[PDB]
Amino acid sequence: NQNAQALNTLVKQLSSNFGAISSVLNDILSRLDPPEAEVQIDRLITGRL
Amino acid sequence: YRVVVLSFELLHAPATVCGPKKSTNLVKNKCVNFNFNGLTGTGVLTESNK
């Protein structure tokens, strides 16, 4: 039960954008320019990590 | 100086407008990034029966 509960929380924890406009890498680069898009993902990898 | 202030949609979903964009063959289950009317996604796309 503990192992299963922890595993799901590790999958549901892909939700929060972590203080950015978007909460999905796929759309971060599509609608932003690295100069201003990279700082957005700065809190995404920093969040998932 | 005409200072008439206008305002379009502010972060709303697609509507009766369609920008000048082309079309291409869709992706069924390919594990690649996709584009369908702006929205972009990656990973693996799997078909369910919902």
Dihedral (C-alpha) A35, B5, B9, A25: value to the nearest 10 degrees? 10
Dihedral (C-alpha) B14, B27, A9, B50: value to the nearest 10 degrees? 80
Q: Who contacts A41 (Cβ-Cβ below 8 Å, separation ≥6)?
A: A20, A25, A28, A29
Amino acid (1-letter code) at residue B10: L
Instruction: Please state how this structure was obtained.
Output: cryo-EM
C-alpha separations of A19 from A2, A30, B12, B27, B40 in Å: 30, 18, 20, 31, 20
Tokens matching residue B19: 């920008």
Amino acid (1-letter code) at residue A4: A
Q: Compute the distance between CA of residue B41 and CA of residue B31 in angstroms, rounded to an integer.
A: 10
Question: Cβ contact (<8 Å) for A26 and B42?
Answer: yes
**The tokens 């990590």 sit on which residue?**
A49
> Which residues of chain A are within 8 Å of residue B33 when distances are taken between CB atoms?
26
E strand or H helix that includes residue B41: strand B39-41
